[PDB]
Design an enzyme around this catalytic site. Structure first.
Site, mmCIF file in Angstrom:
data_model
loop_
_atom_site.group_PDB
_atom_site.id
_atom_site.type_symbol
_atom_site.label_atom_id
_atom_site.label_comp_id
_atom_site.label_asym_id
_atom_site.label_seq_id
_atom_site.Cartn_x
_atom_site.Cartn_y
_atom_site.Cartn_z
ATOM 1 N N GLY A 1 0.854 -1.204 0.000
ATOM 2 C CA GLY A 1 0.000 0.000 0.000
ATOM 3 C C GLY A 1 0.875 1.235 0.000
ATOM 4 C CB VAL B 1 2.841 -0.815 3.748
ATOM 5 C CG1 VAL B 1 3.158 -2.063 4.561
ATOM 6 C CG2 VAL B 1 2.219 0.251 4.636
ATOM 7 C CE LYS C 1 7.775 -11.430 2.165
ATOM 8 N NZ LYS C 1 8.689 -11.568 0.998
ATOM 9 C CG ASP D 1 -5.062 5.641 12.890
ATOM 10 O OD1 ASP D 1 -6.278 5.332 12.738
ATOM 11 O OD2 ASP D 1 -4.341 6.048 11.963
ATOM 12 N N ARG E 1 -9.095 -1.831 10.767
ATOM 13 C CA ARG E 1 -8.099 -1.855 9.658
ATOM 14 C C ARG E 1 -6.667 -1.799 10.223
ATOM 15 C CG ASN E 2 -4.824 1.247 11.858
ATOM 16 O OD1 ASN E 2 -4.246 1.070 10.792
ATOM 17 N ND2 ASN E 2 -5.354 2.411 12.178
ATOM 18 C CG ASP F 1 -0.883 2.002 11.977
ATOM 19 O OD1 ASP F 1 -1.667 1.054 11.754
ATOM 20 O OD2 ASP F 1 -0.260 2.614 11.088
#
Length: 260
Positions: A20, A23, A37, A139, A143-144, A157
């Site tokens: 993204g 990222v 990884k 945040d 989604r985080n 985050d």
């Protein structure tokens, strides 16, 4: 100082494709000779002063020392004057997209109530940890939140106004109790399996909407007991909102009352 104890030799890292935009996937060579990884968040800093880098490298220093199953571990920082945050790569990705996928026949099976609550409990556990280190998330949103390979949830985050507490929208203040408010919205995101908060309501209208006493509505499937826990995160006075320590036990006790 020991703020090089978080900096990693750029040579130990290879960057892959953008995930993204940035990222990126990556490989880190570890102290034991194996290759891990990693995900790699790159940040554009204000380099007109040292203020941004100081704040970054400080926060990064203690983010690296965060050991807890339900908090993502920072592995370190690289500088290609371009800083890079190195985090574990999570094959199952964010919780928000997982919940959306669950509503497709090809994706994950229909997640039962029990599993949704455990996700909420996992996130409370991580936030309870961060509160104990007096560390503001700032945040918190589905989604985080990331899924470890064992399908346990860790926080990450650490204008998204639909997650920002009433006092933080107006006053320009952010405390642990604002994170609690963000945890409320996240719980709702989970119970709705990934709806955007406040259908009907545009972002610029959220302050007035809240100010007139209105809150996110009880989702169709949602237990009253769960909805009262969620609602308690959005009380107008921050001091009336429970702590993450209280929320975690209320949710654990609810989860334990449901069958196996």
């Amino acid at each position: 100082n020991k703020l090089e104890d978080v900096v990693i030799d750029r040579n130990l890292l290879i960057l892959g494709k953008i995930l993204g935009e940035s990222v990126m996937e990556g490989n880190l060579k570890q102290e034991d000779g194996t290759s891990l990884k990693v995900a790699v968040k790159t940040m554009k800093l204000d380099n007109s002063s040292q203020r941004e880098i100081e704040e970054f490298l400080s926060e990064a220093a203690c983010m690296k020392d965060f050991s807890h199953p339900n908090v993502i571990r920072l592995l370190g920082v690289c500088i290609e004057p371009k800083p890079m945050v190195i985090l574990p790569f999570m094959k199952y990705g964010d919780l928000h997209t997982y919940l959306l996928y669950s509503r497709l026949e090809t994706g994950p099976k229909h997640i039962p109530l029990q599993t949704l609550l455990k996700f909420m409990v996992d996130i409370a556990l991580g936030m309870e940890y961060l509160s104990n280190r007096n560390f503001l998330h700032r945040d918190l949103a589905a989604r985080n939140c990331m899924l470890r390979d064992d399908m346990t949830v860790c926080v990450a985050d650490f204008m998204p106004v639909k997650w920002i507490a009433i006092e933080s929208l107006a006053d320009r203040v952010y405390t642990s109790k604002s994170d609690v408010w963000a945890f409320g919205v996240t719980m709702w995101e989970i119970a709705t399996r990934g709806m955007t908060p406040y259908p009907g309501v545009q972002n610029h209208e959220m302050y007035d909407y809240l100010l007139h006493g209105h809150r996110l509505k009880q989702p169709e499937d949602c237990l009253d007991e769960l909805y009262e826990i969620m609602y308690s995160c959005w009380r107008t006075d921050p001091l009336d909102r429970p702590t993450f320590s209280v929320l975690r036990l209320q949710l654990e006790k609810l989860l334990e009352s449901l069958p196996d």
